[PDB]
Amino acid sequence: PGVTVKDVNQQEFVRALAAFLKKSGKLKVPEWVDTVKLAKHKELAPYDENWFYTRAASTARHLYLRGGAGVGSMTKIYGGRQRNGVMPSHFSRGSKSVARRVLQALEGLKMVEKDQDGGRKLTPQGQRDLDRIAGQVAAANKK
Amino acid sequence: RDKLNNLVLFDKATYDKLCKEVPNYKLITPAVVSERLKIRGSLARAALQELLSKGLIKLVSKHRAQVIYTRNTKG
Amino acid sequence: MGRVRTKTVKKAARVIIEKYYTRLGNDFHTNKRVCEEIAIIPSKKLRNKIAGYVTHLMKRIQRGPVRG
């Protein structure tokens, strides 16, 4: 019955773990979450109020796939498409502060720890929790 | 062909029509029901999943760009 | 189409056959090894083209009186 997050859909997994963080009220949510945009290239605010939980889930899943990635790596991953107005579109990264605060809050629940080199990785506690959540979403997908 | 001024919220004169004939034909899609009932289309999408919740209309697709429903099996 | 040879490969092929007829047959892969020691051919793309026209001529020389 071994369940791994890589063995199921990641897009459903991020919803499943965002639900976990929503019901588990331990996230250190800053006061400006209702105002800022997730990226410089993004014109409009997010629609879902639990977007901070969604970002935390997504970066936890990314750190499962590979560790050692810093805030610059996070914003490089979360970059998108800037339409540049009338100029031809280009690629731009997301807000550094949002990813920095998400990562900082991920130390609060003690599942992400900084590394001996640059960046941060998952604790064994986090490695337990990710697949623990993956088990139930796999069960739901099967049934 | 100037404007369509569709319905964003149901009046009773549309909802009574919705109750009886919408779950009575095969190809029921948001665009088709919007053009038949002169409704906005976002309202059509909302009412379509409400009829799904009522359970007398089956889904087939559930796609981000093309959601498709159908009536129940008869005969 | 577009596979017509030039006198550069045609002149060499005629000469080597009538100098070394006893050492040639109707196998291109055999002849392309034959042409290696009997002629210092600067190009790989040329030695096989030289050998290919030889086999075309070797088929005809075993049948009738070719001009060579």
């Binding site: - | 190809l27 899609t29 665009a31 088709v32 289309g41 760009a65 093309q66 498709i68 | -």
Partner: protein, 189 residues
């Protein structure tokens, strides 16, 4: 057996006239699971005939800037359209598509460089390959014209176009242009 999109086998379809059996590729030999194959069919003349007609329609359904490489969106569009025509008719989508092709192919056209009377001066019958090509192109253009500015989606526009062409209604854009071309060719025989 092939179960294109997991269903709609090609075993039960037929072509009513032998004039198109040589080119339409709904046979079991030309049966494919999924209409996406980089077959290099443009590398030689008459190689698109053995190409499956579904793949041909998928390739031809993208036009006008917005859609020139969005093959995945085109495949999902064709999948939804076939599911929709199956819902609306109750029979195999492939037979509906083949019948639409046959009833959409214009049996004649007209063309001249000399001083034409109205449009073209001499009428000439088309090849069956041109028949199939013009049928697919007319279907794609008709769906796009129907869906240029309206709430209906590409899959449903393709669905109604295929159904109208398969039954014969003089309302589909493809059969309308077919009748117009035949009438002009008849006038300028």
């Amino acid at each position: 057996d092939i179960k294109l999109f997991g269903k709609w086998s090609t075993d039960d379809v037929q072509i009513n006239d032998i004039s198109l059996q040589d080119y339409i590729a709904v046979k079991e030999k030309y049966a494919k699971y999924l209409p996406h194959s980089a077959g290099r069919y443009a590398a030689k003349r008459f190689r698109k005939a053995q190409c499956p007609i579904v793949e041909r329609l998928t390739n031809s359904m993208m036009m006008h800037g917005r859609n020139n490489g969005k093959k995945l969106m085109t495949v999902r569009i064709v999948k939804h359209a076939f599911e929709i025509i199956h819902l609306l008719t109750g029979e195999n989508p492939l037979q509906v598509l083949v019948n639409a092709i046959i009833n959409s192919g214009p049996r004649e056209d007209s063309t001249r460089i000399g001083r034409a009377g109205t449009v073209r001066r001499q009428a000439v019958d088309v090849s069956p390959l041109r028949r199939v090509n013009q049928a697919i192109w007319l279907l794609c253009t008709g769906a796009r014209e129907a869906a240029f500015r309206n709430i209906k989606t590409i899959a449903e526009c393709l669905a109604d176009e295929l159904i109208n062409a398969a039954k014969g209604s003089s309302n589909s854009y493809a059969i309308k242009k077919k009748d117009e071309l035949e009438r002009v060719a008849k006038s300028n025989r």
